[PDB]
């Protein structure tokens, strides 16, 4: 059960990801490093104009050796320790040993005040079950 969360973490990998202006479909940020690895504070530099898109599109590519009934995400935006927004997204069923693209739409203080002060804390779940908790500190450039 906490053992099951541990196997799912073991078999999981986020292979690549990007963030797009939903209005134009232009890539604003992409990376192939697994930002959802727990135990370390990740960092990401994004263009300051991403804050001006009302709709941001995300593509997440991941592999999973374990099956999952209801793979989903809870994401919290923290500015200097205070939670400002919460986002929920759901993938659902994941086939064991599969690789999957998951597309999500994310929808609607200046850059210079936010930059370095925002942590996006992401929790992965199989249903009620918490697989991992990770952090990215954001810089806006
Ligand atoms: O912070 C968010 O909410 C959106 C908000 C938007 C402003 C534009 N209009 C609609 C909402 N936002 C904000 C934001 C932060 C504070 C106040 C206002 C806006 N900063 C953003 C930076 C990049 C993209 C969106 C950002 C996204 C940021 C990216 N994100 C995310 N999903 C992940 C999945 C796996 C691992 C990491 C994940 N992240 C964090 C992340 C952060 C930067 C680069 C890559 C990833 C989901 C939540």
Curated annotation (Swiss-Prot):
Subcellular compartments: Cytoplasm, Cytosol; Cytoplasmic vesicle membrane; Cytoplasm, Cytoskeleton, Cilium basal body
InterPro entries: Ig_E-set, PDED_dom, PDED_dom_sf, Rhodop-sen_GMP-Pdiesterase_dsu
Tissue: Widely expressed. Detected in various tissues including spleen, prostate gland, testis, ovary, small intestine, colon, retina, and peripheral blood.
GO biological process entries: visual perception
Record carries keyword Cytoplasm: yes
GO molecular-function term, one example from the UniProt record: GTPase inhibitor activity
Gene Ontology terms: cellular component: cilium; cytoplasm; cytoplasmic vesicle; cytoplasmic vesicle membrane; cytoskeleton; cytosol; intracellular membrane-bounded organelle
Keyword tags: Cell projection, cGMP, Ciliopathy, Cytoplasm, Cytoplasmic vesicle, Cytoskeleton, Joubert syndrome, Membrane, Sensory transduction, Vision
Keyword Chaperone appears in the UniProt entry: no
Subunit structure: Interacts with the prenylated catalytic subunits of PDE6, an oligomer composed of two catalytic chains (PDE6A and PDE6B) and two inhibitory chains (gamma); has no effect on enzyme activity but promotes the release of the prenylated enzyme from cell membrane. Interacts with prenylated GRK1 and GRK7. Interacts with prenylated Ras family members, including RAP2A and RAP2C. Interacts with prenylated RHEB and NRAS. Interacts with prenylated HRAS and KRAS. Interacts with RAB13 (prenylated form); dissociates RAB13 from membranes. Interacts with prenylated INPP5E.
Disease field: Joubert syndrome 22: A disorder presenting with cerebellar ataxia, oculomotor apraxia, hypotonia, neonatal breathing abnormalities and psychomotor delay. Neuroradiologically, it is characterized by cerebellar vermian hypoplasia/aplasia, thickened and reoriented superior cerebellar peduncles, and an abnormally large interpeduncular fossa, giving the appearance of a molar tooth on transaxial slices (molar tooth sign). Additional variable features include retinal dystrophy, renal disease, liver fibrosis, and polydactyly.
Described function: Promotes the release of prenylated target proteins from cellular membranes. Modulates the activity of prenylated or palmitoylated Ras family members by regulating their subcellular location. Required for normal ciliary targeting of farnesylated target proteins, such as INPP5E. Required for RAB28 localization to the cone cell outer segments in the retina. Modulates the subcellular location of target proteins by acting as a GTP specific dissociation inhibitor (GDI). Increases the affinity of ARL3 for GTP by several orders of magnitude.
UniProt cross-references to PANTHER family, sorted A to Z: RETINAL ROD RHODOPSIN-SENSITIVE CGMP 3',5'-CYCLIC PHOSPHODIESTERASE DELTA-SUBUNIT, RETINAL ROD RHODOPSIN-SENSITIVE CGMP 3',5'-CYCLIC PHOSPHODIESTERASE SUBUNIT DELTA
Assigned protein family: Belongs to the PDE6D/unc-119 family.
Protein name per UniProt: Retinal rod rhodopsin-sensitive cGMP 3',5'-cyclic phosphodiesterase subunit delta
Species for this entry: Homo sapiens
Organism ancestry: Eukaryota, Metazoa, Chordata, Craniata, Vertebrata
Gene: PDE6D
């Amino acid at each position: 059960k906490d053992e099951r969360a541990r196997e799912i973490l073991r078999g999981f990998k986020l292979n690549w990801m990007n963030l797009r202006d939903a209005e134009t479909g232009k890539i604003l940020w992409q990376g192939t490093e697994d930002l959802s690895v727990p135990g370390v504070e990740h960092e990401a530099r994004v263009p300051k104009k991403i804050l001006k898109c009302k709709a941001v599109s995300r593509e997440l590519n991941f592999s999973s050796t374990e099956q999952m009934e209801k793979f989903r995400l809870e994401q919290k935006v923290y500015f200097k320790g205070q939670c400002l927004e919460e986002w929920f997204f759901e993938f659902g069923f994941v086939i064991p040993n599969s690789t999957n693209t998951w597309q999500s739409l994310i929808e609607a203080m200046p850059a210079s005040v936010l930059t370095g002060n925002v942590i996006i804390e992401t929790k992965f779940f199989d249903d009620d079950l918490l697989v991992s908790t990770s952090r990215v500190r954001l810089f806006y450039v």
